[PDB]
Subunit: 457 residues, 3 copies
């Protein structure tokens, strides 16, 4: 016998209903094998990879990751791939759930404005990555061409309260992290496995703030977690919790009660979480500079009653989550647009800088700029800041150490350099500070910052 | 008790028969522990890491990976290491199957033209990496000094139709990927874990085309898969199939029905595959730029009857496999040699360029250069190409976008830059195109391309 | 039920006794849940990351990794974090054993000279990483802020002869590996995941030589192995042995009889080893250039009777272990200090160079400088060396090949470049050689070497 030997397809042909991340199609809830017709369309389009940063994504179904496909082991799948006429590249597909050469690739080659099809039997239960298989394969995957297909076991997966769809990827821009504008793909960084962004669901903030996943205390949550790569292996972790279960692909092994689990490039897992106490739980790649410096953080927010017997402490804030603690960073997108249009106002900068100040500066200087007398100097009503705004630009870029006097008190500490901030980020942050807390107002421009970066003090 | 406690060696001393990759010695097929004499000789020698690219490998037995060693748990192994007189370096061995300091390293230190020996009991069943353990350890491993030893369980492994031997490694050349000539080892790239090549069995194409592994529909295939490193962890994957079973080293755990499995640097696994439908199945590191831009692809070709109930589609082609779809790329080796000798002909370039055009250019321009009217412009009988061969060199290196007219039709698309191609590759590709499809002939030299690369348009 | 449902805390409140690496607190040895009070203090301080190389570590309890915490599943833990007044940064904690947002992070935020506390129930047995969770999170982790907490199962872990505590981390210095002085943290290398050092227990040599772990033939050894990252995944391996068992975090899965095991960034495992034959067993990251070029090696030294039936060979030496075969490299620290003070003597250089010569040079030239006639030239009484000390500096930095005559014999071989050695290392090595084996004496300075490095021959 082949696996999946449940006889020929029966009942009526089923047009598959595909979902956009982070949502999942309903359970198939069927006891017979079917012919399932899947229709997926490739679209190439600009979208925001971060606030004010555009990227030309190549997508299955208009999203990164691509549309979720849900079938039953033993189904016959008639797979139709369309390539939107606006596409410049040809595309195809390899689904890891397919038994046969290229996982579908040779039969699915599709030029702009064309359609292809092929048929396969889903012999193997499991969660599987699919992706584009068009030379150069890495460029297509890097541009967002990956998703998940779930092949359910015949009896279905156990019932849970919520199912979600999260997929990591590594991205390669010409520009540095959070450098604004339309950023080209960078082949040299890709070949060197040196990504500028590492994301869940194709954007910074795709699953944070007002885009978080939700559940309640007591509920069970299943997450279908993929790693599209192209290159990185995820040290996949939930901050503040444990996974009840982790199962990779269609593997027989199930691990229980684990916190950190390695998902190979091209791999996928099904994780289960039980919500025990309220708050924000962070999905990360625990290769920490990915999660905290490249975008690899997503949120599952649990509503419900505190249990002080289990955890006496407070919800996550900007100390840990940084600028992603807030509902969104829309002001950054607005100020970037206004720079482009040539209509950038002081208030546009202030609201952008407000968003960026959280975590980045507030961890030491506090959210109200007060600092901590003799330990962290104030930015609120700060004589030192007012006395020399160019020096303040140098301090953000290049750091500051040694004895200073601020508002009549001595400090003798160290502020690390923050050179990774872009010229517009420094300018907007300092403009926010100057227009808050009885400081003198005015503004700092990105051009002001560019000059200080080129000639440090 | 120690493990492996099967009493003293009995019968006659056995001179081990060692195999070159990708082949495996026969099952030991024995019910008693034996003294097994293993004789392995280190050879330092130039060989082709890619077509027209030489590298000084350091080998166990003249191959990368080194000769396969097959023994039975509870055997006494008398290990003899010889260092060929032509060697410049001393060498030794650490076998992961050895219980004792250095896995054999101090007792196996061997200068050029010398021999060493030591004895160990094989206490632990499993598949194990062996490698050189001579300071600087990473340089020796990087130059190819690794292989596998199988310590069988007492009753033997279950019978299969085929057994094969595949080992991944990361390689560090001074030159870039596919830059021709004798390439020195590059310590700086090695320390930074930035390999120029990532290979199965010591060369690009070692297991592709006319060097593929073979089996038939219905047959079972066991592959002993090693990762010699030195530095990379493999996201080891079979395109178009699943592994029936994966077992690491001598581990008790066996995973079944998995597609993607992480093999640590220095690790090894036994995988099993059942062939269900015909075609080419690709073993890759699914850190995708390794498999598709650095050489990390191998083929298992399955012969037999199509099963349209399982897979309705076509065999792998150059869209996915690129220039490795073909039986070999011997023409590239020939043209490189002819450049060195100073006898490079137009036809030498044409045949090299023919090989390199597959996938690289044909994915968009087609294998016959026809393109797709109004979508991908033709290279066949192309007025645009003929009008300006220097512009064509600039297009390959630096890309092309915007409105053009080719053979009377408008195109308004994007051809990405292909800067990673070497000067000789661009020159040979364009020479092929110029001497095909009623184009004007002539040639492009690598020196022509070098000048365009230095001064883009 | 929640897990850990063993009723309210009983008996007396327990003040936890925390241990410094590589030691572990005693088993809890208790049948009832307790309130456990944990007091941990953050200290920022300079310490030696390698001989003569200082780094400002940020520590939990004054060590890297931080103090080990041992509790029982179902305990109520009242966690107190203090920040020493000498600190310049604020700090907090995320323990992977905590159920709740941030693993404790928001409730543990602590400015210099302050204290925080929070309470949590230990619901989940297992070994878990804890680390600082203060923006920028990666900088805090990179500076050493991580450790382990063991939550025992209710019945305790099985008894063993020895328990040890080892934790890997990746470190990012401005300077290159073994470049002397106080080295700043390097954010750019951290973001790129390009560490200068990869260590066990916060320093080169922390667990080698006269700092090795110990046990005897026949004994069982449990090691709690953490990977603090921030970024790297360890291909964790014991040279010369196998792990009886490996269990990750609180996972249900236990793997037996494995040699190489991948520990995620932020992950932890419990490994068990049975000592069968005497000698030095090396714990490494088998991403080999980490273990042999960046510091990622630790030793478990087993005392007891040889068993020639199992292993006929010799203890580890400098061929494999390099300069870490020796009890320590204190002379390097002394000579560095003397350079700083301006009191560097010839004998200070000689003793430093003696330490550095082991492995690095002795693998080919022997520990007595004799070489191997016609294969490796002598450094002992070497006419060639004496004739031109500047040439000798060029040879170490830039290599040597081709025919030479040394002490009346021809050599026609290759000495690779050793450019990664720092100016002081080359100077001290050559000073050692010049003042040994009837060579002419005198000295080479680091300034002499700096000039040759800038103008190769
Ligand atoms: C803690 C790690 C810090 C973060 C994050 C930021 N700053 Fe800071 N800042 C810090 C210290 C300890 C000091 C004093 C250093 C010394 O020599 O003692 C400073 C100083 C400033 C100043 C000048 C003094 C004042 O006006 O209060 C400015 C203008 C300043 N810092 C701004 C600033 C901004 C805008 C930040 C986010 C980009 C930021 N700091 C982060 C400590 C820390
Ligand atoms: C699809 C991704 C492409 C690959 C791979 C290659 N080329 Fe291409 N090419 C492509 C397009 C869409 C265009 C037109 C761009 C525009 O502005 O509309 C081109 C154009 C050329 C041309 C000039 C026009 C012509 O003569 O047809 C040349 C000479 C050309 N391409 C050559 C070429 C070669 C040799 C390739 C492999 C190295 C190659 N192209 C790849 C799309 C694609
Ligand atoms: C084997 C891999 C080597 C290591 C490690 C080192 N050296 Fe070496 N050395 C080696 C060879 C094969 C040769 C001769 C090369 C040739 O052209 O045939 C050398 C030569 C030297 C010399 C000059 C000759 C002599 O005086 O014997 C010097 C001074 C020398 N080597 C020094 C040296 C030092 C100090 C090393 C550690 C830093 C070192 N060598 C390593 C082979 C090897
Ligand atoms: Cu595509
Ligand atoms: Cu794939
Ligand atoms: Cu060797
Ligand atoms: Cu090894
Ligand atoms: Cu901290
Ligand atoms: Cu963590």
């Amino acid at each position: 016998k082949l696996p999946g030997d449940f006889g020929p397809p029966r009942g009526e042909p089923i047009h598959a209903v595909l979902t956009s991340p982070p949502l999942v199609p309903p359970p198939v809830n069927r006891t017979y094998p079917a012919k399932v017709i899947v229709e997926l369309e490739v679209v190439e389009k600009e979208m925001q990879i971060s606030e004010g940063v555009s990227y030309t994504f190549w997508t299955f179904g208009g999203t990164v990751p691509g549309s979720f496909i849900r079938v039953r082991q033993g189904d016959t799948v008639e797979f139709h791939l369309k390539n939107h006429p606006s596409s410049k590249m040809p595309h195809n597909i390899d689904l890891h759930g397919v038994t046969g050469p290229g996982g579908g690739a040779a039969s699915s080659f599709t030029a702009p404005g064309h359609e292809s099809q092929f048929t396969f039997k889903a012999l193997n239960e499991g969660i599987y990555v699919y992706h584009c298989a068009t030379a150069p394969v890495g460029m297509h995957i890097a541009n967002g061409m990956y998703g998940l297909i779930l092949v359910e076991p015949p009896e279905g997966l156990p019932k849970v309260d919520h199912e979600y769809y999260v997929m990591q990827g590594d991205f390669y821009t010409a520009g540095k992290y959070r450098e604004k504008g339309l950023q080209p793909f960078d082949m040299e960084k890709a070949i060197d496995e040196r990504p500028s962004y590492v994301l869940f669901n194709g954007a910074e903030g795709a699953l944070t703030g007002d885009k978080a996943l939700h559940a309640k205390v007591g509920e069970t949550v299943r997450i279908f977690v993929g790693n599209g790569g192209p290159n990185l292996v995820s040290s996949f972790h939930v901050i503040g919790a444990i996974f009840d279960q982790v199962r990779y692909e269609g593997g027989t092994n199930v691990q229980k009660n684990v916190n950190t689990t390695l998902i190979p490039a091209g791999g996928a897992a099904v994780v289960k979480f039980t919500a025990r106490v309220p708050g924000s739980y962070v999905l990360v790649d625990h290769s920490i500079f990915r999660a905290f410096n490249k975008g690899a953080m997503a949120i599952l927010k649990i509503d419900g009653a505190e249990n002080k017997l289990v955890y006496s402490g407070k919800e996550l804030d900007s100390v840990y989550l940084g600028d992603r603690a807030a509902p969104n960073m829309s002001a950054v997108t607005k100020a970037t647009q206004a720079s482009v249009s040539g209509t950038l106002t002081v208030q546009d900068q202030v609201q952008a800088g407000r968003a960026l100040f959280a975590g980045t500066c507030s961890v030491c200087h506090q959210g109200n700029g007060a600092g901590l007398p003799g330990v962290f100097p104030p930015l609120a009503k700060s004589d030192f800041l007012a006395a020399d705004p160019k020096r303040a630009m140098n301090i953000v870029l290049h750091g500051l150490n040694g004895k200073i006097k601020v508002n009549g008190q001595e400090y003798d500490s160290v502020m690390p350099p923050m050179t990774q901030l872009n010229d517009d980020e420094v300018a907007n942050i300092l403009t926010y500070v100057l227009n808050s807390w009885d400081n003198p107002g005015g503004r700092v421009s990105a051009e002001d910052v560019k000059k200080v970066r080129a000639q440090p003090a």
